[PDB]
Amino acid sequence: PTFYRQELNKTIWEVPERYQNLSPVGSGAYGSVCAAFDTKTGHRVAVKKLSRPFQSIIHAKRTYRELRLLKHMKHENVIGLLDVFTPARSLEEFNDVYLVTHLMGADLNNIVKCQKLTDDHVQFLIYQILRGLKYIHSADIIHRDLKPSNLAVNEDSELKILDFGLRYVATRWYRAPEIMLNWMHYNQTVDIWSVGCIMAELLTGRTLFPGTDHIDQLKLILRLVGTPGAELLKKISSESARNYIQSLAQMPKMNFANVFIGANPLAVDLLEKMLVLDSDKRITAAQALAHAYFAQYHDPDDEPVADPYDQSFESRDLLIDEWKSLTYDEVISFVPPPLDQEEME
Ligand SMILES: Nc1nccc(-c2c(-c3ccc(F)cc3)ncn2C2CCNCC2)n1
Ligand SMILES: N[C@@]12C[C@H]3C[C@@H](C1)C[C@](O)(C3)C2
Ligand SMILES: N[C@@]12C[C@H]3C[C@@H](C1)C[C@](O)(C3)C2
Ligand SMILES: N[C@@]12C[C@H]3C[C@@H](C1)C[C@](O)(C3)C2
Ligand SMILES: [Ca+2]
Ligand SMILES: [Ca+2]
Ligand SMILES: [Ca+2]
Ligand SMILES: [Cl-]
Ligand SMILES: [Cl-]
The missing domain is CATH 1.10.510.10 (Transferase(Phosphotransferase) domain 1)
Known part of the structure; x- marks a missing residue:
């Protein structure tokens, strides 16, 4: 995919051409958020750019934690993931993480x-x-x-x-x-x-x-x-x-x-x-x-319950590059959900 750059909230965002008309809608946990139009589906989305996701082992583990959590969440009243992307072409270039969910105004x-x-x-x-x-x-x-x-x-x-x-x-x-x-x-x-x-x-x-x-x-x-x-x-x-x-x-x-x-x-x-x-x-x-x-x-x-969630990583101290590599793995393995995941009762 082709990426483009745009300065938003005084910093450069680099996002796939799929997401257009980005506009800031405030900060989130460890990042800032823009609304966007998803040209693939016509849906409005919110894109969160993580702020300094790998600055220290604290940042790197919290980045991994957030991506793991959001990849697991599949519930209509819980934020979950439509997409996750990075402009990086390899692990060696990997330093930016963007998370995408449905826009909630x-x-x-x-x-x-x-x-x-x-x-x-x-x-x-x-x-x-x-x-x-x-x-x-x-x-x-x-x-x-x-x-x-x-x-x-x-x-x-x-x-x-x-x-x-x-x-x-x-x-x-x-x-x-x-x-x-x-x-x-x-x-x-x-x-x-x-x-x-x-x-x-x-x-x-x-x-x-x-x-x-x-x-x-x-x-x-x-x-x-x-x-x-x-x-x-x-x-x-x-x-x-x-x-x-x-x-x-x-x-x-x-x-x-x-x-x-x-x-x-x-x-x-x-x-x-x-x-x-x-x-x-x-x-x-x-x-x-x-x-x-x-x-x-x-x-x-x-009113469903969740699938079992493996949090064994929380007790582990790993090196920054290990958290980074695990996070990269989770980005690459992400499978976007179907657009329509619900059926009449
Ligand atoms: N407008 C909107 N819509 C959906 C979510 C958010 C959002 C996210 C967020 C999280 C994960 C993700 F993948 C994408 C965005 N983090 C904080 N916010 C807030 C930004 C302003 N306060 C209320 C919501 N903002
Ligand atoms: N800049 C916008 C503002 C609204 C939400 C999102 C981002 C899609 C859009 O079409 C409507 C453009
Ligand atoms: N019931 C909704 C509320 C928001 C605007 C419009 C109507 C599209 C939707 O996806 C988001 C569902
Ligand atoms: N918001 C309050 C705080 C105190 C307890 C309860 C709730 C009654 C009140 O009068 C005093 C108002
Ligand atoms: Ca349906
Ligand atoms: Ca019902
Ligand atoms: Ca029923
Ligand atoms: Cl799990
Ligand atoms: Cl784990």
Whole structure:
């Protein structure tokens, strides 16, 4: 294929002639993204150029990690790969990686910002997040930083999770307490806490826990969910942190019906099951999909799990050129999916 060069975001992109009319649509994880027209299919795509993919073993392994993950993801609510390309003609020339997916014009902040959503629409948005999470969680992949800006949405409110599983000042308002505060154990339900925070904000138009720092955010959380038991302290390494929490004036759990006034009582019930401090008592994604709040959308035949995903590489320290060669292998072996991968139920 013939490549062409274009300066985008102050740097040269080199892309196959297949992709035309590139226009910047923002940064992504370790890279920047342009929308483009795929002349082969007439589809609109998003092309991510990785920034310095092989600068160090940290960059090189994260490049491999991202390509492996995206090659594995085949779910309608999860970002996956239409194409992956490099201008390099051989491994010796290989220093640039571009990833291609379907174009999603907005993030979730674009959906709720200027639109009072209906409850039926909120149901659909949260349902899609949970379906995507069921899939990634089934492959032992956790997001860990799920938030509105990591949910890509198209013109018809179809949503995909991105930037999951990936060892600048980010918002912490949606992070699970066990992540934000570096507690000693956590599971896949870290992402369910984030869903609760997202859903609360879609229903009320207000950030649920807009803390100015980690301590202020914890205080806002405890005012809603109540002071934790001694059992929860088991998970916290720092004595100063445990002593502080234990020292706080005790607060009762709020009745969520008094917090989310006017909301669908089924929404309030689901929120009560998601926004619990004990990650072992938090509802899972698969359980949440069965909740009556989503009754009009739920379809067990269309909520699939993932194929087994081999993450053995995560425990390995390899040399930079080994990660580079493995990444090159994954670029070369990529098989684009069929354009139409779905059939009427
Ligand atoms: N517009 C759009 N559409 C789809 C995805 C993205 C995208 C990607 C990305 C990931 C993999 C890939 F192969 C191609 C692109 N990474 C971050 N973003 C974001 C860019 C702006 N914030 C929301 C989406 N952006
Ligand atoms: N520059 C564009 C803007 C829109 C998305 C993508 C990139 C395809 C296009 O045809 C419409 C051109
Ligand atoms: N339902 C959709 C939403 C976006 C615009 C248009 C209609 C084409 C599509 O592929 C992306 C599907
Ligand atoms: N966003 C808030 C933060 C605190 C807990 C809960 C949710 C009730 C509230 O009045 C205080 C607003
Ligand atoms: Ca269906
Ligand atoms: Ca069916
Ligand atoms: Ca079809
Ligand atoms: Cl695998
Ligand atoms: Cl592996």
